[PDB]
Amino acid sequence: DDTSSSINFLTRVTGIGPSAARKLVDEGIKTLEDLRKNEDKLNHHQRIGLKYFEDFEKRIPREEMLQMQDIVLNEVKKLDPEYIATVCGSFRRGAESSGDMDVLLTHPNFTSESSKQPKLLHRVVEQLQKVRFITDTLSKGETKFMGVCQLPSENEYPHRRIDIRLIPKDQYYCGVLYFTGSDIFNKNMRAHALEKGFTINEYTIRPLGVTGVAGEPLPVDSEQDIFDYIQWRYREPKDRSE
After folding, report:
1. Could you tell me the fold of the domain covering 59-172?
2. DSSP code of 127?
3. Tell me, which fold does domain 1-58 have in CATH?
4. Which of 109, 160, 191, 224 is spaced 20 to 30 A from 24 at the CA atom?
5. Hey, where are the domains in the chain?
6. Which positions make up the binding site?
7. Distance of CA 160 to the CA centre of its chain
C-alpha cells in the first residue's frame, strides 16, 4: 500500500536493501527526513548513500566522464606505469552519458596465482584521495573499492559513484570484455563461443570437451585474443550494442 510505497522509497538509497529496508520500517522509519534523524541506525555505507541521495540520482554526461577518466589515468601512471587501468561500462561503448564510473585495474605483479595484494589497489585510492577526487568511501575490500568522487571545482559538480576493481592480470581481458557489455552482446558472444567449442565467463575462456563438463583457461593478453579464439572479427566496443 502507500506504505509499501515506503519500502520502495528507502531502497533508492545505496546501501538500503529490502531486508535492510524492511526493518527500518518496523522501526517507524519511512521518509527521508526520517532517515536523517536517524543516522545511528544506518551503516557507513547507507550513511554515505543518504548523504548524496540527490546527486546520485543525476546522470553523468560524457564531457565529465572524460575528465574523470583523465584524472584516474594520469594518477595511476605516476605511481607505476606498469599499472593497466580501463574505464568500462556503456561509457567505453561510446555512451552519451553514464550512471557511474567503473574502473578495472590490473598489474603484472598480480595474477590469479598470487591472490593477496591489497596495497596494489589501496595505493591508487589513496592517491586519488590525496588529490581530492575520491571524497568518500562506501566500502573498501582487498580487491574492490566503492566510493564517491567529484570533479575539481574551480569556482560545483555533483558527487558520483565510482568503483575500482583489482583483477588478476591473467583474467583481466575477459574482465574488461565483460564489464564492457552490453548484456546482449555478452550473451550473443557466449552463445557463439559455445558453437565454437568454448566456454566464456567474466574470468576466462576455456575449451569444452565430451559430455561438456570441460575446461582449462587459454591465455589472453588482449580483448582481440578472445575474438581470435572464436574466430570472429573483432568488434570494437562501439559496435557492441548486441
Report:
1. Beta Polymerase; domain 2 (3.30.460)
2. H
3. DNA polymerase; domain 1 (1.10.150)
4. 160
5. 1-58, 59-172, 173-241
6. 11, 13, 16, 59, 90, 93, 99-100, 102, 163
7. 13
Residue numbers in the known binding site for a 2'-deoxyribonucleoside 5'-triphosphate are 59, 90, 93, 99-100
3-state secondary structure of 229: helix
How far apart are alpha carbons 45 and 51 in whole angstroms?
Answer: 10
Q: Are strands 101-106 and 160-166 parallel, antiparallel or unpaired?
A: parallel
Superfamily of domain 173-241 in CATH is DNA polymerase, thumb domain (3.30.210.10)
Per the listing, cell 575528465 goes with 67
H-only helix segments in the chain: 4-10, 18-26, 32-36, 44-51, 62-79, 89-92, 118-131, 172-178, 183-195, 223-230
Resolution value in angstroms: 2.3
Which residues line the annotated binding site for Mg(2+)? Answer: 100, 102, 163
Identity of residue 147: G
Query: Which amino acid, one-letter code, is at 144?
Result: K
What H or E segment, with its residue span, contains residue 60? strand 60-61
Binding-site annotation, residues for Na(+): 11, 13, 16
Residue positions in the annotated binding site for K(+)?
Answer: 11, 13, 16
- Side chain identity at residue 85, one-letter code: A
Please give the Cα distance from 190 to 230 (Å, whole number).
Answer: 10
The answer to whether domain 1-58 and domain 59-172 are alike in fold is no
| Cβ atoms of 105 and 165 closer than 8 Å | yes
Say which experimental method was used.
Answer: X-ray
98 Cβ partners below 8 Å, 6+ apart? 59, 60, 62, 65, 89, 90, 91
